[PDB]
Design a protein around this ligand. Structure first.
Ligand SMILES: C[C@@H](c1cccc2c(-c3ccc(CS(C)(=O)=O)c(F)c3)c(C(=O)O)[nH]c12)N1CC(CNC(=O)CN)OC1=O
Ligand SMILES: [Zn+2]
Ligand SMILES: [Zn+2]
Length: 232
């Protein structure tokens, strides 16, 4: 009924949308992994009379439900999707997207990691993102590679028309007390990568983490703090 939806409010399999700004929504879904249930976020950005999707809804059935929710709530076709790293909360559902006519994209790094781990593989490679600090335009967003953090391939997304920073899994919510799933992380580089985000996007007004509640720029400093303490 208006607040940002939380893990216990979303049954696994359904998707909620949350209006972030004009032409910008987050999508929220839940999934089971290793016997626990987790929420996860993605982004939808209006691109004229089409939509750009950032990240799947963490699985094939969730991603089908995402498409149905977009049709109900927004009613514009999703034409392109970008996955921000290779884990299943970002690429799981790419095969559903590809069968619904969505062109799927990811960096070459993400595509290689997805293939090696047996996850779904976006069709198209995003060049121009291989060095930390690189940025490219993709429709109504900028894609930015901050360096290794949550994963070596993680991308962040900025919506310049709205000053919305989608940090993906490189950014944690303010309530986080640990650095999430660190299986493929670089805890030593992560603060430096967050510092690159802070320097590149100082006018961000909303910051969206990969999991949990949006806030403002404080999410970035909080992330650096929880990662430094996890490393210790
Ligand atoms: C799908 C993803 C995954 C599965 C289950 C949970 C997560 C979380 C998570 C956990 C806890 C918190 C609360 S908190 C901040 O207080 O800790 C949170 F916000 C997010 C994150 C994240 O952190 O992005 N990703 C998760 N996988 C799976 C994985 C295993 N893969 C290999 O080892 C190589 N293929 O490596 C991930 O990341
Ligand atoms: Zn991940
Ligand atoms: Zn994640």
């Amino acid at each position: 009924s208006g607040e940002y939806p939380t893990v216990n409010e979303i049954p696994v399999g359904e998707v909620r949308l949350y209006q972030i700004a004009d032409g910008v929504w987050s999508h929220i879904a839940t999934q089971s992994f290793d016997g626990a249930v987790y929420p996860s976020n993605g982004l939808i950005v209006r691109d004229g009379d089409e939509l750009l999707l950032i990240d799947t809804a963490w699985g094939a059935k969730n991603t089908a439900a995402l498409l149905a929710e977009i049709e109900k709530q927004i009613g514009l076709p999703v034409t392109r999707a970008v996955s921000t790293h290779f884990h299943d909360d970002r690429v799981g559902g790419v095969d559903v997207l590809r069968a619904a006519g969505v062109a799927t994209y990811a960096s070459p790094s993400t595509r290689r990691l997805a293939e090696a781990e047996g996850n779904e593989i976006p069709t198209h490679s995003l060049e121009g993102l291989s060095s930390s600090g690189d940025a490219v335009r993709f429709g109504p967003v900028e894609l930015f590679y901050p360096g290794a953090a949550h994963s070596t391939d993680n991308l962040v997304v900025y919506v310049p028309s709205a000053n919305v920073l989608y940090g993906g899994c490189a950014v944690h919510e303010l309530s986080s007390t640990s650095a999430g799933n660190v299986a493929d992380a670089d805890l030593a580089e992560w603060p430096t990568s967050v510092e690159r985000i802070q320097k590149h996007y100082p006018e961000a007004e909303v910051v969206i983490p990969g999991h949990g509640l949006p806030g403002g720029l404080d999410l970035l400093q909080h992330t650096a703090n929880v990662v430094k303490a996890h490393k210790n």
